[PDB]
């Protein structure tokens, strides 16, 4: 269908991939750093979801450079993807409002 709905879909699939890759890379970057908690996959995945949604619980976060880099990619992909949906919903509303104006 329309570009905005495809982009939304694409963004979602992409986000889910970043989430998974992010979980795997966080563990890899963090293991080896004393005091690190982002070291098992199940919670790292919870961490990536937390991060991508910016929910801010603060129960887990990276302590290494590479882990922080992985964090930036994840949050940014999350902010962007959700902003994309917002933009897609606006395109939907703007298009329907034009119709409701018989023009």
């Amino acid at each position, epitope marked *: 269908s329309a570009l905005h709905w495809r982009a939304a879909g694409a963004a979602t699939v992409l986000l889910v991939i970043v989430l998974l890759a992010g979980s795997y890379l966080a563990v890899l970057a*963090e*293991r080896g*750093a*004393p*005091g690190a908690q982002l070291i*098992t*996959y199940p919670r790292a995945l919870w961490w990536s979801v937390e991060t991508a949604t910016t929910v801010g619980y603060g129960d887990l976060y990276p302590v290494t450079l590479w882990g922080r880099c992985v964090a930036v990619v994840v949050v940014v992909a999350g902010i962007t993807s959700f902003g994309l949906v917002t933009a897609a919903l606006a395109t939907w509303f703007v298009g329907r409002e034009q119709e409701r104006r018989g023009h």
Partner: antibody
Amino acid sequence: QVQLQQPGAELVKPGASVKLSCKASGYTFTSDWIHWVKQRPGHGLEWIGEIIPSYGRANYNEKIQKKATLTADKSSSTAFMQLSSLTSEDSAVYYCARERGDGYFAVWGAGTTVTVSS
Amino acid sequence: DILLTQSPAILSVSPGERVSFSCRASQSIGTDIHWYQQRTNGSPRLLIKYASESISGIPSRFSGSGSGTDFTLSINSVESEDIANYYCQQSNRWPFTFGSGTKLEIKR
């Protein structure tokens, strides 16, 4: 069947250096980590280090003198541990274990009794 | 590093009694503790993961409890086959660490 296989023993002369092996079998995920644990007679379990085969990245217990080096042959599903310049202090049973990246060692090898002696 | 204290080091129980092994961490670690059993000259065997989750193939009389810094591994009605060393292990913070272990001893 036996998921981890280690040679029962290895004899090493002081200053020498042996390479222990750990052949794995059963379900193999990319997320698997192989750990190595040292147990001196009488004493308890001491974590040595870890390695993730699907990347070759390894980490070591930095609280103890570093005498190990880990590598892994993805082809033959085998983990290797290179111990170098051993002394009487390095004689003990070395276990290897498999961790599915979720924090616990589900399965351990039978362990290799390394004896450093002339 | 996270210190895992297992005290007392030796437990003397009578056949059939209920025994309780203790594991105290130096800092809070949720329920990220795991229990292993090691018999004379055998290798470690996972008995309980994440503080209280039973593992398949382990006698129902084995269980664990606790969270934070105090953990307990309990055995309802001990028996000769249970005689061994019991270690706790933590996966909350890097690196993973093991308690010093407690030997179970049956007074028959």
